[PDB]
């Protein structure tokens, strides 16, 4: 199954579809996709586990439309299911006194007045949708990975690593991960870090000459690419 | 593919009862063909999707080989009360059932096209790190066509041979459980599961298994008396096990002697397999290379006796 789509794609999406304003389907991505973060930070779950509800949030939106679908119910869905795939399990029960911890009276609405059933049906609507391709992979693994191949400063690379780890759990608030893979952003983190501390990466690499230091990572990626996943992470903090 | 579809499955009857649900013979409609349909239920349970379920089909995706069960599809029925339906290829027959009744009897190239099928599909589960831990007699599917399958990988965990990964100690189950489990390693190999074969090995040539008690305790001493007793000579690290000293059955290796009708070919194989040392036990790629399954051309094999029951 083909989980990447392009931006034309994602301007037509089934919730745009139903007449949804775009600028708000990007705020009630970042809203659900920072909430199974909250929760699940509270439960005390690994990162890929929380990045993995993510992912299956994302990609649930792109075959459902959010005025159908109430966002902070799927969230907490696609938390429980992915505690389960990532073998780090909650109970469905302890996922919702989080919830009602982190939501007011108005979002907590949105599971009605018996909150597990209705978190429940919704899984077996949400495994059909990513039809049962439970297994994902995250930025995380490889931002280590490509870190780890670097001759330099160690004070100055582990600064790299901080700074690109934070615009990873940022990348996971749009809808990057469904526009690359997650080779790519963890490249791209490294990138725009990279660019910010004034970092020669190129120089930390086999190849101090060459000013491409990813392609020895990532095959086949114009700088226009990273470039376009820095801009969609800064405007997260553009107002 | 997406993996959605309503049951345009015609069921001919029930198979049995397995894990999490029952289990359905029948033919698509679409394609022909028969296929087998393990229930999935979710009206029954708080657990949502069961998750032992989910690590089943997180490897099953991973595993494509010849010789292993393989996940076709899942489908569905269709706030509802619908249940999941999990499509495996359909094998008519298993290797105990067979053995149960006194009908089928296996000649000495079966055996060798059979072994080799099994071992072929642990070294495709090994490379990609994949623990079976539950080989039996029953878990292993044969058709009419002289195809073996290997099945039923609910208990199977992914490997790490950095030796970082404690696992659980109950696996296999008794008959076919390994001497190191049995004395309380948690920290072990693939070579588990190629002792499992061991123990097929050795069944396929005496009709009935070879290791049969009802206790932990009784099925050491029965591997004991004919595979030795576990002396650090031949087990330097038995010592470094929690149940060796409170375990203790000496016995002499008596294994070629209690299997002299087996083939030399087959029995260097049986013996290889069947030793006590995890470190010093044959492998599946070694086992694929012995002197009773290298020359064995699968295409060059004529298809068993099988009759349809």
Known sequence: ?239 | WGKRCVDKFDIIGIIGEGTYGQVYKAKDKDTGELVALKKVRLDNEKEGFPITAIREIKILRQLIHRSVVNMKEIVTDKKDKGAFYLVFEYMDHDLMGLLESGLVHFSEDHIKSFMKQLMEGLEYCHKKNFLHRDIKCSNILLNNSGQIKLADFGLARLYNSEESRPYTNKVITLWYRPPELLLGEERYTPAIDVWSCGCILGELFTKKPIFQANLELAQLELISRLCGSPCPAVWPDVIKLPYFNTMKPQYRRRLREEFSFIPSAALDLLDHMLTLDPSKRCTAEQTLQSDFLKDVELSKMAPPDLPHW
């Open chain 1, 1 to 239: 199954p083909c989980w990447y789509w392009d931006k034309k794609d994602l301007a037509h999406t089934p919730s745009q579809l139903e007449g949804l304003d775009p600028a708000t389907e990007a705020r009630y991505r970042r809203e659900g996709a920072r909430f199974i973060f909250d929760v699940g930070t509270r439960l005390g779950l690994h990162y890929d586990t929380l990045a993995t509800g993510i992912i299956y949030f994302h990609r649930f939106y792109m075959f459902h439309s959010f005025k159908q679908f109430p966002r902070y119910v799927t969230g907490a869905c696609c938390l429980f299911l992915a505690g389960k795939v990532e073998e780090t399990p909650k109970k469905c029960k302890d996922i919702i006194k989080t919830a009602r911890s982190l939501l007011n009276d108005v979002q907590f609405g949105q599971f009605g007045d018996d909150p597990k059933e209705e978190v429940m049906v919704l899984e077996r609507i949400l495994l059909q949708t990513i039809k049962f391709d439970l297994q994902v992979e995250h930025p995380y693994q490889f931002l280590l990975k490509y870190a780890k191949q670097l001759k330099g400063d160690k004070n100055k690379i582990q600064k790299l690593v901080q700074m690109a780890w934070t615009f990873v759990n940022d990348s996971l608030c749009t809808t990057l991960s469904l526009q690359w893979e997650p080779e790519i952003i963890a490249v791209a983190v490294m990138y725009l870090a990279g660019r910010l501390c004034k970092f020669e990466i190129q120089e930390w690499t086999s190849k101090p000459m060459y000013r491409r230091w990813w392609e020895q990572f990532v095959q086949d990626v114009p700088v226009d690419v990273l470039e376009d996943i820095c801009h969609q992470i800064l405007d997260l903090y553009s107002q």
